[PDB]
């Protein structure tokens, strides 16, 4: 009985296993751009 | 006020549909569609917080037929064909860029 | 931003530049008290949707009522908008639902002037 760490989430939806993978890849490979003026 | 009522409003107001959403460990994600008769682009928006918020834009070409993507090739700048990261303050600028590109 | 509906509205506020302050339906239709804008300028207005039943179908006909809200703006802000926005955007307007995106585009280009 020591408690635990967790993270909160909205009810926006549970992803698939593939989407979890996709998110990490897309962040990692994203090209940084500051604005679109 | 329901989520369907808000989604209906913005579909007719600024031509954006939200199809699928999910939250994973990196952030909030939205399978999104934008445009009109002139041209439609599907894409993924992800909001990853680090507190500052970053937006990840992922283009989605699968729904596009061969003809509407050769039109897309002419209308879109190259960066809208690639996965982008940008701060949250530029999201509206992004929408306007995408609107003007599709409307060409 | 805990509730899903707040997340959706936050998304459209940052994406389309429109904040919905209230949603309600009374005997005059379905109404949105909204603001649209950014650093360049803000316009307050109500959007009303007047559904009339079609003759031969469940598919409703929708008329949009635009009511600009100037009464609570300062005179200084009101003269800044007068240079950017055409006169009809300071009047109550009505137009079919299908023209709503054109209205939004016309609003957006005016505010970004």
Author numbering:
A (entry chain C): 29 to 65
B (entry chain A): 69 to 118, 126 to 179
C (entry chain B): 67 to 179
Can you provide the manuscript's text about this entry?
In S. cerevisiae meiosis I, sister kinetochores are fused through the action of the kinetochore-binding monopolin complex, and together bind a single microtubule. The conserved core of the monopolin complex comprises two nucleolar proteins, Csm1 and Lrs4. These proteins form a distinctive V-shaped complex, with two Csm1 homodimers bridged at their coiled-coil N-termini by a pair of Lrs4 subunits, thereby positioning two pairs of Csm1 globular-domain “heads” ~ 10 nm apart at the apices of the V. Each Csm1 globular domain has a conserved hydrophobic cavity implicated in binding the kinetochore protein Dsn1, leading to the proposal that monopolin could bridge Dsn1 molecules from sister kinetochores to physically fuse the kinetochores. A ~ 40-residue region within the disordered N-terminus of the core kinetochore protein, Dsn1, has been identified as the kinetochore receptor for the monopolin subunit Csm1.
We therefore screened paralogs from several related budding yeast, and successfully purified a complex between the Candida glabrata (Cg) Csm1 globular domain (residues 69–181) and the Dsn1 Box 1-2-3 region (residues 14–72). We identified crystallisation conditions for this complex and determined the structure to 2.3 Å resolution. Our structures of the Cg Csm169–181:Dsn114–72 and Cg Csm169–181:Sc Dsn171–110 complexes reveal a consistent interface between Dsn1 Box 2-3 and Csm1, while the Cg Csm169–181:Dsn114–72 structure reveals a second interface between Csm1 and Dsn1 Box 1. In the crystal structures of both Cg Csm169–181:Dsn114–72 and the chimeric Cg Csm169–181:Sc Dsn171–110 complex, the Dsn1 Box 2–3 region wraps around the Csm1 globular domain, with Box 2 forming an α-helix that packs against the “side” of the Csm1 dimer, and Box 3 binding the Csm1 hydrophobic cavity. While Dsn1 Box 2 forms an α-helix and associates with the “side” of the Csm1 dimer, Box 3 forms an extended conformation that packs tightly against the Csm1 conserved hydrophobic cavity. Our structure of the Cg Csm169–181:Cg Dsn114–72 complex shows how Dsn1 Box 2-3 binds Csm1, but also reveals a plausible Csm1 binding mode for Box 1. In the structure, Dsn1 Box 1 extends outward from the Csm1-Dsn1 Box 2-3 complex described above, and interacts with a crystallographic symmetry-related Csm1 monomer. Interestingly, Box 1 is oriented in the opposite direction across the Csm1 hydrophobic cavity than Box 3, with positively charged residues (Cg Dsn1 R35 and R36, equivalent to Sc Dsn1 K75 and R76) C-terminal to the hydrophobic residues, and negatively charged residues (Cg Dsn1 D29 and E30, equivalent to Sc Dsn1 S29 and P30) N-terminal. Thus, both Dsn1 Box 1 and Box 3 bind the same surface of Csm1, through similar but distinct interaction modes.
